[PDB]
Design an enzyme around this catalytic site. Sequence first.
Site, mmCIF file in Angstrom:
data_model
loop_
_atom_site.group_PDB
_atom_site.id
_atom_site.type_symbol
_atom_site.label_atom_id
_atom_site.label_comp_id
_atom_site.label_asym_id
_atom_site.label_seq_id
_atom_site.Cartn_x
_atom_site.Cartn_y
_atom_site.Cartn_z
ATOM 1 N N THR A 228 -4.341 -5.027 1.070
ATOM 2 C CA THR A 228 -3.913 -3.918 1.209
ATOM 3 C C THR A 228 -4.526 -2.696 2.051
ATOM 4 O O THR A 228 -3.902 -1.872 2.826
ATOM 5 C CB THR A 228 -3.312 -3.149 -0.129
ATOM 6 O OG1 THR A 228 -4.451 -2.727 -0.887
ATOM 7 C CG2 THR A 228 -2.662 -4.244 -0.844
ATOM 8 N N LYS B 241 0.727 -1.216 0.050
ATOM 9 C CA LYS B 241 -0.011 -0.138 0.113
ATOM 10 C C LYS B 241 0.814 1.229 -0.190
ATOM 11 O O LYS B 241 2.012 1.286 0.710
ATOM 12 C CB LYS B 241 -0.913 -0.068 1.401
ATOM 13 C CG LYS B 241 -2.254 0.974 1.079
ATOM 14 C CD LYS B 241 -3.076 0.407 0.222
ATOM 15 C CE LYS B 241 -4.457 1.012 0.331
ATOM 16 N NZ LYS B 241 -5.398 0.181 -0.368
HETATM 17 O O1 LIG Z 1 -6.788 -6.968 -6.101
HETATM 18 C C1 LIG Z 1 -6.736 -6.506 -4.935
HETATM 19 N N1 LIG Z 1 -5.698 -7.023 -4.523
HETATM 20 C C2 LIG Z 1 -5.302 -6.810 -2.954
HETATM 21 O O2 LIG Z 1 -4.274 -7.158 -2.544
HETATM 22 C C3 LIG Z 1 -6.290 -5.841 -2.368
HETATM 23 N N2 LIG Z 1 -6.363 -5.481 -1.066
HETATM 24 N N3 LIG Z 1 -7.403 -4.878 -1.060
HETATM 25 N N4 LIG Z 1 -8.115 -4.846 -2.266
HETATM 26 C C4 LIG Z 1 -7.204 -5.644 -3.088
HETATM 27 N N5 LIG Z 1 -7.655 -5.818 -4.141
#
Ligand SMILES: O=c1[nH]c(=O)c2nn[nH]c2[nH]1
Lengths: 304, 304, 303, 303
Positions: free
Chosen positions: D66, D6
């Site tokens: 994330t 992130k």
């Molecule tokens: O495609 C995704 N991968 C991830 O790791 C993730 N984490 N939150 N949203 C997400 N969407």
Amino acid sequence: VMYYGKGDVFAYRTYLKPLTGVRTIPESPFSGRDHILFGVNVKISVGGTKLLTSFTKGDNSLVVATDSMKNFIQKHLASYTGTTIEGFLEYVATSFLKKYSHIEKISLIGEEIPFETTFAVKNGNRAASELVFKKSRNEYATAYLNMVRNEDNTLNITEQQSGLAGLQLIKVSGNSFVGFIRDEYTTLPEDSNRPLFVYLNIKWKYKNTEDSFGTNPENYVAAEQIRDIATSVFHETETLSIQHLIYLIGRRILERFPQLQEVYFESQNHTWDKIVEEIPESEGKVYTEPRPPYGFQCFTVTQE
Amino acid sequence: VMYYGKGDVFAYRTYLKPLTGVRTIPESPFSGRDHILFGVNVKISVGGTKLLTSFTKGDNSLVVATDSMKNFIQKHLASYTGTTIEGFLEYVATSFLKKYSHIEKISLIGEEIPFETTFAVKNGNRAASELVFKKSRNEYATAYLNMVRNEDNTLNITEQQSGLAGLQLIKVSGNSFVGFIRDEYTTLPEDSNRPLFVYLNIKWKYKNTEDSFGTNPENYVAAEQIRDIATSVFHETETLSIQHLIYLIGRRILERFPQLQEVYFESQNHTWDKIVEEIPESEGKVYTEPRPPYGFQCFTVTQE
Amino acid sequence: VMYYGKGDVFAYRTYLKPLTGVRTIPESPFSGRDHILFGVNVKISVGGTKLLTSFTKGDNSLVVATDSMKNFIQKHLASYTGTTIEGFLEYVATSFLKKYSHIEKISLIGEEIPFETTFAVKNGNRAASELVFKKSRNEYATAYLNMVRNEDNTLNITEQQSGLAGLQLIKVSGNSFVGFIRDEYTTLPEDSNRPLFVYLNIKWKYKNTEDSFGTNPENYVAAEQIRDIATSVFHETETLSIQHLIYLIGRRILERFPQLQEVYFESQNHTWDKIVEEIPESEGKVYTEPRPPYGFQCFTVTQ
Amino acid sequence: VMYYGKGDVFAYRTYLKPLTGVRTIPESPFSGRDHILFGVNVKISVGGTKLLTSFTKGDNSLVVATDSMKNFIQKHLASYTGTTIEGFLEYVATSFLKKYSHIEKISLIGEEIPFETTFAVKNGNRAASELVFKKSRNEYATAYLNMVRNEDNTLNITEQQSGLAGLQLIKVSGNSFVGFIRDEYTTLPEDSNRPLFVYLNIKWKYKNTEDSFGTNPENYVAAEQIRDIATSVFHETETLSIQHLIYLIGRRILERFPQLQEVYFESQNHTWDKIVEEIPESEGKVYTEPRPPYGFQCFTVTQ
Ligand SMILES: O=c1[nH]c(=O)c2nn[nH]c2[nH]1
Ligand SMILES: O=c1[nH]c(=O)c2nn[nH]c2[nH]1
Ligand SMILES: O=c1[nH]c(=O)c2nn[nH]c2[nH]1
Ligand SMILES: O=c1[nH]c(=O)c2nn[nH]c2[nH]1
Ligand SMILES: [K+]
Ligand SMILES: [K+]
């Protein structure tokens, strides 16, 4: 570390030799580049042990001015007789090391400055103009080349990479993100149908550096073709995550281009937040921009 | 002056009613908008004498929170049944004044967030995807609307303007700039063949505000059509200056769209500096980015 | 509309005449500018009925090239003997209209490119360097001037405004936003103690345009002084909204500077979203950046 | 490569524990940070062999979202009891690896979001406000940390670096660039007195990573002190190139901070083009912005 150089060396060339004779793939109509207008933004970095005293003593005797590097690049775009950014970098690199024997290493980045065609009426019909083009601030091709001088004054390429940068793709439906860890840090709901919005930077490496130059254009891998693979695979796939998507894109790239050794992805998640889930008498919905934090993924797929 | 409001109200709608039934012109293939994905960035400003004490005394009794204005806009994009940004602004404006009777004036800007189509293979053929789109950071349509509440609680539009912003066009040859004043402040050489690079923002005003909404779509003037006029006229014209070019663009716009009252241009000059004038055995040349100072022009053409 | 010109005319001058002897106010230590380094970004626009054929016919006979306007501005910064951006604009405007008799109107914007002092050790103690400066991307002073040629060939300033742009202030506590309309569209909670984060652009007009030039520095209103009034008033005030805050800043400016006729504000709200309301054994909280939509206010206070 | 994470995790905390008692150096008045307002922009990257199927199969079973990493960072800023960005990164890294046993590697970047003091009138005199701060878009401190889980399940910092980013310094005189190669490609004139304008990003590594945390503040190296060393050395030095300048800055840093192992520079040249070389009755000149191409240098000095 000890290097110096010049960045943002913009150079625009008219009537570069056209790129033709390319090998097609199902996912892309791409058949070549007209090269009426060819723009590149170049960054050059050089190093060598004999530059030490330029730092430690202020002795400029062996300093090629960075302004002179700019002149060198721009003059070489005028004399370049090839057809690709990759080949242009090779020409600059070899020429620069030949000129400056005290330079041991050169690194070059070239970023395409893309232009799109526009419409004009003349002689009774509308057609694409051969004179008027539109600057594009969307995706662009890239190239990277590093070359060294060895003890015997021979020169060798030590790394080459091509790429596509700034691709921004949104798929309105047909994407899920479910099944992730739900613990005391989790507030994200599971979502069986999200409008996934990804930023993609895709880089590839050839098995044989010669194929990158366009001299035998059937072995060249065009950024346009890579773009079209990415969009096709995104469309075709019920995505389960960005991680899942980029693996599948990379597999398709390596299947279509057996001359490639590997492909590398840097992706970012920019998916919108939902505001309205159901609209009377429509399949539509309303979304808006999220808060700043963005997810990202970095991943290599190899022929092995 | 006394106003307040909300900016950067992004709103993305899927499956807006498509725009069709438009009237074509020679310079443009444009035939409508699919509206699978419709993005807009809205700015709202409101005023009224009864807001004075919100400033002079800190009394928020009659303050619609700017956050609530954001909710209002986003909810109204969900319920909007029309086909244009212009009509969306009218719907928001009328609805907002009807809701808040102490508001005397509302001003709205809507800026298109444009998306382009992408390729995908399925069922044995490559075609444009109905699911995957590419965010464009190039030119975009605009709309402006101002509405007032009069003493009798009736509402009136007091200004409307549509536009095209962010168009960046370079014409490689067929442009001159000669004959200007040569005095003690002049160092610019005369140039009989320059690669003129112009940024254009073009705004138009309709004779009848109803034609802007798309309700009778044959009277709508699409930003896509304006773009294509601009590129055609630039191609067709041996330009003598930007001033000369934009006049000719405006004349063509007013000839093709008799329902327009006037067109307004804001243009900027971003022409590159020449580095190499002659290349052995080629018609090409090399150019680079200029220093920051940019010329600009502001000009209205009217049917009169 | 029929105008043309040049934007982003950057011009940096070393050793401009110092601005000295400005009347001070309690909120600010400002009394002058050393002018070792003076940077301005100028935009010039010109009009005149005799420019019509440059558009309608492509006739460049009466076109002063925009490149030549850039040269004009840069050379006039070298010859300018005054002490303010406002006065520099007047000098450019008067000079340009005197040079080019076919021009009937000129508009100028000047934006300060600000540089801050830095420390250097001189004779064993830190002092401000007279040579090394830090380029600031924070707030900056502005000036605007519009001058016309009348029918009797006198020149007249028709509009003048000075300003401070890019001021970004956050007050951690002592701000409320309560009592606003709660209806079907309202989701914002009332907040009796928010960390209000405002962006401010503040512009002022003088009763007498001559006071803007700095020729009598005692009557000059410096953007630095306006900045310090804004921070002092924000500190002193339990704010009830941005609207309330900017009114009070405006009143203080006009009280401190009776020579001003008006002050105009453009403000934006960038207050963070609260994430953690309570931290054990601490008065602190945690916040984060909001979504993009931002509130704004526009308001004039008059003398 | 196989990592995910992130970026742009903004987190603002009020009333972080103050940093106090930092050993001073002659070039800088810095001895601590009040921490009334503490802002950081964090980027987190994680890896581990057990993440393979999240890519190859679309299996999210071992995916920490994330979004959840963002929550983790923001909550840990609330619980952090230390005094530096470097220490905050260590706390996040250790905590995350202790929480998620399938993660083998974590990399963190933290970028200060800096705020400056402002004036307020308190009891009839201007003083620094304890409530109102100015958001700065100028230079900012940085920190980087990479931590791994070993085969014996101990955790180990494998890389640590602190820095100062975004410093933009212009020295009006006392700089030369002469003696460089003049050949067919050289058009740049020699200049015995140029107004050298450098952008500097300066990064340092400690001999002992613990010194970066601030737990013993006497061994902490503050970005503010590095800034003031850079300005002092630039002032004191008749520079011969950027290359020469950054070497001398690096040597001074290492002399002042024997606990550092290395200093790394990334510099850029943004020196203005000269327009007017001589102004009557003045020592000043006029300059303007160059074309876009910029020189740069990258260089490490070691202790
Ligand atoms: O495609 C995704 N991968 C991830 O790791 C993730 N984490 N939150 N949203 C997400 N969407
Ligand atoms: O088209 C142009 N118009 C102008 O006014 C001008 N001035 N310099 N170059 C110019 N080009
Ligand atoms: O100070 C504020 N004024 C407003 O109008 C407003 N609306 N939402 N939050 C706000 N804060
Ligand atoms: O300090 C400088 N170093 C360089 O390498 C250089 N090249 N051009 N100008 C320069 N200035
Ligand atoms: K094909
Ligand atoms: K047509």
